[PDB]
Design a protein around this ligand. Structure first.
Ligand SMILES: [Mg+2]
Ligand SMILES: [Mg+2]
Ligand SMILES: [Zn+2]
Lengths: 106, 106, 106
């Protein structure tokens, strides 16, 4: 796919996570987030449409999505342990990371 | 690296997992699977031999092995929670992901 | 950022981990190690400053830091389970891996 839809999936599942009631919902939403982040690793953002796929910029873009995958992982750990509130709290910081990323590469 | 046999290693450790009797065997096979997935990140498959290490096709190859490493992780998490049979089910789905990769890239 | 400073962050947190007494200390230092390894994915090491960002050499350099992040992951899992000493042992081997990497690329 392409970058815009991966950002859309990320924010859709962040909203699911805020709205959720139990650990299972958070876990599934985080799985969709990790899938979307790994997918965005394959896309080229609008702002870097003019830069090479091997340019330093594209490397930092992909590594940023590896960092997002690892943060998602930690939140998924909280959700798998059953700590719904702590997972929701972690997801708020994930939202900070996602909105900043969308801001930069919009 | 050496793409050809990392696929062999993943298939053989899936054979190990299906045949396995205890939690320990599946975890060890999953750790060997993660090693093989990450290692395969370094190689070039046949289908991409005339392509750049940085070609978009090559980028998608490497990201696909990140996805495989993350799937393996979920399977290992299950085996670590004490859910040996749930882990073997996850491994069955890994079997579909891996042989899917053998086609297209061989 | 910068490669050698990432190496120094890894070495300092290895020391913190060996001297620590509780799971929280080990977890905090390993999370810092994971941050620094993922960051190092973004740098270019001295030995490869003559190579393309898309070179096979640079690809292997980045994949090695994916491997280091996964090993850090396993140690953090040990620390979360309450196995403080096993996490420290795992960290000693992380030190072996790090000093090998520091030698190869330097
Ligand atoms: Mg920095
Ligand atoms: Mg971890
Ligand atoms: Zn984990």
């Amino acid at each position: 796919a392409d970058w815009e839809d991966n950002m859309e999936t990320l924010n859709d599942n962040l909203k699911v996570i805020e709205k959720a009631d139990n650990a299972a919902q958070v876990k599934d939403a985080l799985k969709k987030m990790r899938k979307a982040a790994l997918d965005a690793k394959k896309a080229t953002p609008p702002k870097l449409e003019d830069k090479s796929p091997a340019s330093p910029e594209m490397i930092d873009f992909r590594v940023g999505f590896d960092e997002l995958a690892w943060e998602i992982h930690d939140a998924a750990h909280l959700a798998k342990e059953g700590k719904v509130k702590e997972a929701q709290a972690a997801a708020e910081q994930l939202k900070t990371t996602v909105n900043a990323h969308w801001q930069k590469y919009r």
